[PDB]
Amino acid sequence: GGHAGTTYIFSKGGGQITYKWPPNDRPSTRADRLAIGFSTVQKEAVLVRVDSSSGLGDYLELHIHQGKIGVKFNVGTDDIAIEESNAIINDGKYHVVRFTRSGGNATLQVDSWPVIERYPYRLGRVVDEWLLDKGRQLTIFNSQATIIIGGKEQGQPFQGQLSGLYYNGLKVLNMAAENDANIAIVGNVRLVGEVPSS
Numbered sequence: 001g002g003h004a005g006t007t008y009i010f011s012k013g014g015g016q017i018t019y020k021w022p023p024n025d026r027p028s029t030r031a032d033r034l035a036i037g038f039s040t041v042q043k044e045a046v047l048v049r050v051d052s053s054s055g056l057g058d059y060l061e062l063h064i065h066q067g068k069i070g071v072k073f074n075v076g077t078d079d080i081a082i083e084e085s086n087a088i089i090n091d092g093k094y095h096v097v098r099f100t101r102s103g104g105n106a107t108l109q110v111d112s113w114p115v116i117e118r119y120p121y122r123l124g125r126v127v128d129e130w131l132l133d134k135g136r137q138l139t140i141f142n143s144q145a146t147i148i149i150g151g152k153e154q155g156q157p158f159q160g161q162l163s164g165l166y167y168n169g170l171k172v173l174n175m176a177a178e179n180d181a182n183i184a185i186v187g188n189v190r191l192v193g194e195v196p197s198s
C-alpha cells in the first residue's frame with residue numbers, strides 16, 4: 001500500500017527528529033532489526049542513523065546513494081556495507097526496507113525483491129569467560145545513545161515522507177507524535193494529520 005499510520009514530511013532545508021536514551025538505559029545488542037517506509041526523488045540522502053555514546057565507534061546508517069538504498073555499519077572491527085544495487089528507488093513512490101543483523105551476519109530487503117545475505121577450577125573459569133566476554137563485544141552494538149532521523153546532522157538532509165519506523169521494539173515516529181519526553185523535533189518536519197476516513 002502507501003504510507004500507513006504515523007507519518008512525517010521533511011521539506012526545504014530539512015529537519016531532524018532525535019531520540020535520546022536516558023544515560024543509564026543505553027542498550028547493547030547482539031541482534032538488530034530496522035524497518036521503515038519512505039518516498040523521495042533524491043539521488044543521495046541519509047535517512048536514519050543510530051550512534052553509540054561519544055568516544056565509542058559503533059554505528060548503523062540507512063542511506064540512499066546513486067538512487068539505491070543501502071546500509072553501512074560497524075560493531076567493532078571494519079566497516080560493513082550492503083546495497084540493493086539492482087532497484088532504482090528515488091522515483092517519488094512508496095517503498096519499504098527491512099534490515100537485520102545477528103552478530104557478524106546481516107540481511108537487507110527492499111520491497112518484495114530477493115533478500116541480500118552477507119556472511120579447571122574457580123579462577124580459570126572466571127578468567128576464561130572474561131576473555132570470551134572481550135571477543136564477544138566485536139559483534140555487539142555497544143552503548144546506543146541516539147536515533148537521529150532526517151540526515152541533516154550528517155550533511156545529507158532527507159526531503160520526502162517517512163512512516164512506520166521500527167527499531168528494536170521502538171516505534172520512533174509514533175513516540176514523537178505522542179510527545180515522548182526523550183524526543184526532540186527541529187527544522188522543517190511536519191506531522192501529517194488523519195484521514196477523514198473518506
Ligand SMILES: [Ca+2]
Nearest residue numbers: 075076137140
Ligand atoms: Ca561493539
